[PDB]
Homo-oligomer: A and B are copies of this chain.
């Protein structure tokens, strides 16, 4: 009857464990790539919104509204006093 060698069984078990872990590593890489792609898409959407707002006068209109509101507040304070 052959005499078993303890080290060989442990080495085989470790090899099987490594083979199992490689697939989990690949899955983690896929998840990371997907997350980066979604972040890039969100950045693109933000840049597109910025382009759309800058093309029109909305950015300047908001500043004009702020200045007009400040002036109206000053006028109201003058009237109340």
Q: Is A3 an interface residue (CB 8 A)?
A: no
Copies of this polypeptide in the complex = 3
* Smallest CB separation, A46 vs chain B (Å): 5
Contact of A33 among B21, B32, B63, B67 (CB under 8 A): B32
B31 touches A31 (CB 8 A): no
* Smallest CB separation, A41 vs chain B (Å): 5
B74 touches A77 (CB 8 A): yes
Return chain B residues, CB-CB under 8 Å to A34: 28, 31-32, 37
Return chain B residues, CB-CB under 8 Å to A35: 36-38, 40-41, 44
Residues of A within 8 A of B (CB): 7, 10-12, 14-51, 53-55, 60, 62-71, 73-81
